[PDB]
Curated annotation (Swiss-Prot), chain A:
Positions bearing the Glycyl lysine isopeptide (Lys-Gly) (interchain with G-Cter in ubiquitin) cross-link: 5, 90
Outcome (variant: residue 142 to A): Does not affect ability to cleave and inactivate human TRMT1
Domain Peptidase C30: 1-301
Function: Cleaves the C-terminus of replicase polyprotein at 11 sites. Recognizes substrates containing the core sequence [ILMVF]-Q-|-[SGACN]. Cleaves and inactivates human TRMT1, preventing tRNA guanine(26)-dimethylation of tRNAs. May cleave human NLRP1 in lung epithelial cells, thereby activating the NLRP1 inflammasome pathway. May cleave human GSDMD, triggering alternative GSDME-mediated epithelial cell death upon activation of the NLRP1 inflammasome, which may enhance the release interleukins 1B, 6, 16 and 18. Also able to bind an ADP-ribose-1''-phosphate (ADRP).
Regulation: Inhibited by pyridone-containing alpha-ketoamides compounds 13a and 13b. In turn, alpha-ketoamide 13b (tert-butyl (1-((S)-1-(((S)-4-(benzylamino)-3,4-dioxo-1-((S)-2-oxopyrrolidin-3-yl)butan-2-yl)amino)-3-cyclopropyl-1-oxopropan-2-yl)-2-oxo-1,2-dihydropyridin-3-yl)carbamate) inhibits SARS-CoV-2 replication in human lung cells. Inhibited ex vivo by michael acceptor inhibitor N3. Inhibited ex vivo by compound 11a and 11b.
Encoding gene per record: rep
Active-site residues, record numbering mapped to chain: 41 (for 3cl-pro activity), 145 (nucleophile)
Location(s) in or outside the cell: Host cytoplasm; Host Golgi apparatus; Host nucleus
Reactions that this protein is recorded to catalyse: TSAVLQ-|-SGFRK-NH2 and SGVTFQ-|-GKFKK the two peptides corresponding to the two self-cleavage sites of the SARS 3C-like proteinase are the two most reactive peptide substrates. The enzyme exhibits a strong preference for substrates containing Gln at P1 position and Leu at P2 position
Protein name as annotated: 3C-like proteinase nsp5
Residues of the full protein shown: 3264 to 3564 of 7096
Segments on the Cytoplasmic side according to the record's topology features: 1-301
Length: 301, 305
């Protein structure tokens, strides 16, 4: 029993973290086989902050300009190329600790673990969700760029995120491992702002099912609702609308607890209307939205 | 910016997790050098847990009864002994992935990372605090026994907890790596209950400092208080009393933010007597008490391991 926000064990990812230095900028790189992946902004100078031409900056670089350090060993850069906003540094040594891995692009609402690093050294691991506005609410300081987000599929590491920037509101933006940003963000110092964040409704419902599995039933009610009426109410509380895909995904939890999805939706509508009234659900006074239906099944089984 | 509940990177500990099987019971073991540590209740089955004489049960067991598996490799048990509630299985192979380590006993309020495992395989890592009632509010299923709690300082792993049991309220109990339980618990199937839990006051104060470092200042007020006045109020809300040791430990955060400890105590006293008023602190509607002052400095300054 018990329900915790749990990250994946980070060992497989720690053995891939290296330090990448280019001029006066130092950040983290992900060393997989003979390639080190890192944010392309590691090549930016003091004048290319607002309008960098990364293709123009990278052409002017040589392999000897990139300092890559894996622990106490300096790796030799033998090639460099750019794929979108990620720089790929070909090195002369394959990482012997390279786990089984894949690069995945995730959707909003998906969760993942972040191994926060500084100077190529892992400092902490936490759990995140890709917000509906495509930002992540991380904990990153200067020098955390190149830290990665991942999930672990049995023995396989699925890399889904690489950290690039902090927006003015303190939220974070980054790319998948092919260098494509999540959201309408650019690796430029131009005025950028995240859209208004909304609650991941499907994840709140999954967490209410986790609470019922763990014995917490006080918020249940005898009502049901149509999907359209639930969406109309939920959108007024800045909750994401729930699609038929989300209803189907909650099916196994609905079958496990004996509470239909639309019955649980009526509990959620009531919670939004009344608040908690001094009560907590799974030790929380707010509705938690960073547990997916898959996370709930995995942790409760 | 940002403030998350963050665990230590678990790699150094994952390389020590093995599976220990004795009869029909399978749980986790911690393989350090040529010794595998695990809960001694692995030698129990059905009648054994009701009234166990662990010394009598262990004497009857042979080395070959213990099946130890490290990944896809079976380790051979060449000796066995018991230290309190932990079983130590001497193996014929030293763990090549043994990190620099020490066994430490922690105090209530102290936090640590838990590497939750099943069948010797790490499945998740989470951060928690040793509650004042000596339980931990973990997330553990059957087969999680033997999972360990740890901290990392520099490149040194300090093992502070080993999981043994779940109490009827869903909270968890375990021992240090010398087999001594945290709290008034015993490793026997008998009626046991945790004492009433209290809030780790020094940790709430550290988390309020983390909130200020991150820009959340709505709860700050012009007032200060005495340690005596604060403790009298706090103890009525089931908060742990704050000692001069706790005030000194918060010193660096008080210097960094310009909010003296007793100044922050006055904010906390108002937060208890008046509530949040619909507001949140670091995205939370409750006061968080599972971040120590050291955790806050570490996360808000980027110390690496
Ligand atoms: C490697 C850190 C870094 O680059 N951070 C930024 O957000 C940059 C600051 C200047 O503006 C900017 C524009 C575009 C891009 Cl892609 C990056 C930046 C950064 C990332 N995470 C956390 C941070 C905390 C404090 C300062 C900078 C941070
Ligand atoms: C390794 C699992 C286990 O032993 N768990 C227990 O709590 C035992 C259940 C029977 O009573 C008992 C008495 C004393 C001791 Cl030391 C252990 C037990 C166990 C541990 N964590 C989570 C669990 C979840 C569900 C069942 C059993 C759990």
């Amino acid at each position: 029993s018990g329900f915790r926000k749990m990250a994946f064990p980070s060992g497989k990812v720690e053995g891939c973290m290296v330090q990448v230095t280019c001029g006066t900028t130092t950040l983290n790189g992900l060393w997989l086989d003979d390639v080190v992946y890192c944010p392309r902004h590691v090549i930016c100078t003091s004048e290319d902050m607002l309008n960098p031409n990364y293709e123009d900056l990278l052409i002017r670089k040589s392999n000897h300009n990139f300092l890559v350090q894996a622990g106490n060993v300096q790796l030799r850069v033998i090639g460099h190329s750019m794929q979108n906003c990620v720089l790929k540094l070909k090195v002369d040594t394959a990482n012997p600790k390279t786990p089984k891995y894949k690069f995945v692009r995730i959707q909003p609402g998906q969760t993942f673990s972040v191994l926060a690093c500084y100077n190529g050294s892992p400092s902490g691991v936490y759990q995140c969700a890709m917000r509906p506005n495509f930002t992540i609410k991380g904990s990153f300081l200067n020098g955390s760029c190149g830290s990665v987000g991942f999930n672990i599929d049995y023995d396989c590491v699925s890399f889904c995120y690489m950290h690039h920037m902090e927006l003015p509101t303190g939220v974070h933006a980054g790319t998948d491992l092919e260098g494509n940003f999540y959201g309408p963000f650019v690796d430029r110092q131009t005025a950028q702002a995240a859209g208004t964040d909304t609650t991941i409704t499907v994840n709140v419902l999954a967490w209410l099912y986790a609470a019922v599995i763990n014995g917490d039933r006080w918020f249940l009610n005898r009502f049901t609702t149509t999907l359209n009426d639930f969406n109309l109410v939920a959108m007024k509380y800045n909750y994401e609308p729930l699609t038929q895909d989300h209803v189907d995904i909650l099916g196994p939890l609905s079958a496990q607890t004996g509470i239909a999805v639309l019955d649980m939706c009526a509990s959620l509508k009531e919670l939004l209307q009344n608040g908690m009234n001094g009560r907590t659900i799974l030790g929380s006074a707010l509705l938690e939205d960073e547990f997916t239906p898959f996370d709930v099944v995995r942790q409760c089984s």
